[PDB]
Design a protein around this ligand. Structure first.
Ligand SMILES: [Cl-]
Lengths: 119, 46
């Protein structure tokens, strides 16, 4: 099944960069945003977008950056949105093998190299 | 507005009603100011 919806597990310029590529290729896009980024540009730049880091499913509010660093939150969003692939951009969870493994686990294409490659 | 299209809306202020009997509500929508004008039916205005 060719890649049909990408979630971009990032913010700012690089989220926006990836949204452009996917969109030019005919691929739908999902953004995530923490509460502190509820007014950020990048979140209005995707086909649809969802909040990470607060709500019923969490013991406490996640911090502004911590919300983007949560593996469970990204995965939870890829499922809720029905994304088939995730772009980590740069920084954040882009060099996490625990993150790569989580994506494998849920059958979501990690747009990056294999977990063994990151170790 | 839809799954995955979240508006943030702040009621900044509400004006005294004017003559012609209009009230303007000053909102912020996703950070941006927006004024909306509504009749003040409560209080007799068309
Ligand atoms: Cl934080």
């Amino acid at each position: 099944g060719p890649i049909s919806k990408i979630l971009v597990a990032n913010r700012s310029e690089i989220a926006i960069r990836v949204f452009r590529a996917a969109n030019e290729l005919g691929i739908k896009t999902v953004a995530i945003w923490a509460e502190e980024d509820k007014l950020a540009l990048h979140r209005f730049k995707a086909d649809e977008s969802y909040q990470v880091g607060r709500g019923p499913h969490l013991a406490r509010d996640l911090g502004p950056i911590e919300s983007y660093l949560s593996i469970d939150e990204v995965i939870r969003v890829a499922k809720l949105s029905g994304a088939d692939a995730i772009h980590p951009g740069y920084g954040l969870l882009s060099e996490s093998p625990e993150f790569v493994d989580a994506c494998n686990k849920a059958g979501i294409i990690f747009i990056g190299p294999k977990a063994d490659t990151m170790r | 507005i839809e799954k995955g299209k979240t508006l943030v809306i702040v009621n900044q202020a509400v004006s005294a009603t004017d003559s012609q009997g209009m009230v303007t509500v000053f909102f912020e929508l996703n950070g941006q100011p927006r004024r909306i004008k509504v009749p003040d039916r409560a209080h007799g205005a068309t």
